[PDB]
Design a protein around this ligand. Structure first.
Ligand SMILES: NC(=O)C1=CN([C@@H]2O[C@H](COP(=O)(O)OP(=O)(O)OC[C@H]3O[C@@H](n4cnc5c(N)ncnc54)[C@H](OP(=O)(O)O)[C@@H]3O)[C@@H](O)[C@H]2O)C=CC1
Ligand SMILES: NC(=O)C1=CN([C@@H]2O[C@H](COP(=O)(O)OP(=O)(O)OC[C@H]3O[C@@H](n4cnc5c(N)ncnc54)[C@H](OP(=O)(O)O)[C@@H]3O)[C@@H](O)[C@H]2O)C=CC1
Lengths: 330, 330
């Protein structure tokens, strides 16, 4: 195990030029930790918030949220994992050849002899599926018959949400920026389609819901959609605001939730997988759905780790559908 | 039916001197409305928000939220009520000898022979019981074994919540400004007591919840308890912010709900009794609980309508427990 490795990091906030592919230390591990050599890591929109200074982080800051790979070292007290075990896990600093995580943390042991193709699939699906599952179970518990507004409907999280909402018998009103995206959203389970580049979103939502509004809004767009979601919600509806793609929602007076008794939730994945029991619940569900092919994980493109800047530009351009994946160099 | 009556109104914002006991027209009614002669009307803290300019209202503004009385006139299209019916109802402009409401609104027909004491009881209990029922059913669905933080615990809504939370098998952590008030909260079902005037609230909450925090906070205090509730909540906890006794909560970034996946609700009673089906559900439940004295309605003091200003001063002084009621001389 080397002293140094290649990672993607940022030294400061800014545009794509601040993304660096550089030598960086391999982390040391404690008695309960795993050292994992990564093979694949998923691209997630959140990296843009850190890069732009929307979310704070101590810099130099190694990027990444999830990875799949192989345990190459373990602490003295680790019995639930073996060296050579193939794993998928949620962790920072995963745009890297080597990352560490607690053996008690959000790491799942994959079946022995898992292939590289499957490893890529798990790296592509893990974070976004866990997010979709937990947000539709706990943030707002989606019921059969619910009308649900879904923004960024053909994106990574969006395509998983489409599938889950269909499975649950919800009526999904999908919003995306092109007709070609909405076609894919439909393929993935969306019932009603709104092209935000052509149509009045609120007017269409009210049309599809008989003027009543939606039971819940799963809205990852933030600033530019806040007023639309609030207006589109039915009385007693639930607003799950879970992203900032168009910017942060400015500070608001919670009195605005009152006329329609709107419930507000601004969740993050971590808070639903924080215990071993919560992690086992959702990671087991993730595995079952993906393995049985009940959930499809659409991969837009795979890029070498050093090409993350291209992936960042692609996803932020709004051109993409599904998941972008980065191949970690051996 | 007279053309003129007496009411309590405000012409402008300010202190108690702006509360006026004034001549005012008896309202004209539409074909679907009832005219009700009031006997009793409850005091509610919300009147302070309108008087101080915290909540906007068109002035001159007649005060009141709830009353009990007798139907003295109805519109030609009304068949679900008769002249002579005794009623309990939720309506504005009820600090008055005569008020109107839609026959399709939140008004309930009381049994023939309802006594004067019962009329008083219903006017004392209606708004606060409906609030407590709906907020513990829908705003946050209280479960057996939940730890629940309760501010203003010996107040009108507070004493109802203490009783309901106990009935549901929840564990109430009651917060109030004196030991004497807390003794009453305990009598009404509180399991834990915190004197906000001399204790470290968060430290006591963490003691009582064994470090976990509360499952929900029912917090009617607003500005000055915002931070404490957020800190006191368990991971995945629900914040039911439902009053502004200390002032409005200033605008804040909803990302502050993210570290603990906190659900936020800022409900108003109306939004849970907005249609005939919802109104029937909660008003039937209110009646059973209050008529049977399963729920106790503590009356602090009864004032004549003309003396609302003393009641306003009393409740705002923080010296009161339970409900203040206004009696209208007939
Ligand atoms: N709270 C949490 O724990 C998590 C939150 N997220 C959030 O969910 C969202 C989806 O993540 P992910 O699947 O990685 O990304 P996506 O693949 O969905 O890409 C982002 C999409 O957002 C839409 N969008 C709307 N407005 C803008 C804008 N002004 N600029 C750029 N894109 C915009 C675009 O679709 P279109 O053009 O069709 O509108 C774009 O394709 C992100 O906002 C992300 O931050 C993701 C995972 C966990
Ligand atoms: N959202 C809704 O639909 C409804 C909201 N409400 C709200 O619920 C709360 C209770 O109403 P109600 O029972 O009528 O009133 P209360 O009888 O509870 O009287 C208000 C109590 O609030 C407490 N309080 C805390 N901080 C302050 C402060 N800075 N100034 C004055 N009082 C303070 C006091 O108790 P202590 O000294 O022990 O702290 C006081 O006794 C109110 O905030 C009201 O606006 C009521 C009904 C419906």
């Amino acid at each position: 195990i080397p002293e140094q490795q290649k990672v993607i990091l940022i030294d400061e906030i800014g545009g794509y030029d601040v993304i660096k592919y550089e030598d960086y230390p391999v982390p040391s591990i404690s008695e309960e930790e795993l050292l994992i050599k990564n093979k694949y890591t998923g691209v997630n929109y959140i990296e843009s918030y850190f890069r732009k200074g929307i979310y704070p982080c101590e810099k130099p800051y190694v990027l990444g949220r999830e990875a799949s790979g192989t345990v190459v070292a373990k602490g003295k007290g680790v019995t639930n994992f073996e060296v050579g075990d193939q794993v998928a896990y949620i962790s920072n600093s995963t745009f890297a050849q080597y990352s560490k995580i607690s053996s008690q943390g959000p790491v799942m042991k994959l079946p022995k002899g898992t292939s590289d193709e499957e490893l890529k699939l798990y790296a592509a699906g893990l974070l976004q599926v866990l997010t979709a599952l937990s947000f539709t179970n706990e943030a707002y518990h989606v019921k059969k018959g619910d009308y649900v507004l879904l923004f960024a409907a053909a994106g990574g999280v969006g395509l998983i949400l489409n599938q889950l909402l269909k499975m649950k018998g919800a009526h999904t009103i999908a919003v995306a920026s092109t007709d070609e995206k909405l076609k894919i959203a439909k393929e993935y389970g969306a019932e009603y389609l709104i092209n935000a580049s052509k149509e009045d979103i609120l007017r269409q939502v009210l049309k599809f819901t008989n003027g009543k509004g939606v039971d819940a809004s799963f809205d990852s767009v933030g600033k530019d959609t806040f007023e639309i979601s609030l207006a589109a919600l039915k009385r007693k509806g639930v607003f799950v605001s879970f992203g900032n793609a168009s910017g942060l929602i400015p500070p608001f007076s919670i009195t605005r939730l009152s006329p329609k008794n709107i419930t507000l939730v601004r969740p993050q994945l971590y808070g639903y997988i924080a215990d071993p029991e919560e992690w086992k619940y959702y990671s087991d569900e993730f595995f079952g759905l993906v393995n049985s092919k009940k959930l499809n994980i659409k991969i837009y493109k795979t890029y070498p780790l050093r090409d993350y800047r291209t992936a960042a530009a692609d996803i932020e351009s709004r051109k993409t559908v599904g998941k972008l994946v980065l191949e970690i160099p051996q």
